[PDB]
Amino acid sequence: LXLXLXLXLXLXLXL
Amino acid sequence: LXLXLXLXLXLXLXL
């Protein structure tokens, strides 16, 4: 487990 | 896009 793939960034909101 | 899900907290740096 840790930071890379998962939740926070990517698809959903933003540009 | 940018924020939400795909990348971030889950799997990765921490292992």
Coordinates of C-alpha atoms in Angstrom, one line a residue:
Chain A
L1 CA 0.0 0.0 0.0
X2 CA 1.1 3.7 -0.4
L3 CA 1.1 6.6 -2.9
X4 CA 0.9 6.0 -6.7
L5 CA -2.3 4.2 -7.9
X6 CA -5.6 4.8 -6.0
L7 CA -7.6 7.9 -5.0
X8 CA -6.8 11.6 -5.0
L9 CA -5.8 12.3 -8.7
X10 CA -7.0 11.2 -12.2
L11 CA -10.6 11.1 -13.4
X12 CA -13.4 12.9 -11.6
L13 CA -12.8 16.7 -11.4
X14 CA -10.4 19.4 -12.8
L15 CA -9.6 20.4 -16.4
Chain B
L1 CA -9.9 15.7 -15.1
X2 CA -6.8 16.0 -12.7
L3 CA -8.5 15.3 -9.4
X4 CA -10.6 12.4 -8.1
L5 CA -9.6 8.7 -8.7
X6 CA -7.0 6.7 -10.6
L7 CA -3.8 7.9 -9.0
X8 CA -2.9 9.0 -5.4
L9 CA -3.3 7.1 -2.2
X10 CA -3.8 3.3 -2.5
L11 CA -0.8 1.3 -3.9
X12 CA 2.8 2.5 -4.8
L13 CA 5.4 4.5 -2.8
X14 CA 5.2 2.8 0.7
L15 CA 4.7 -0.8 -0.6

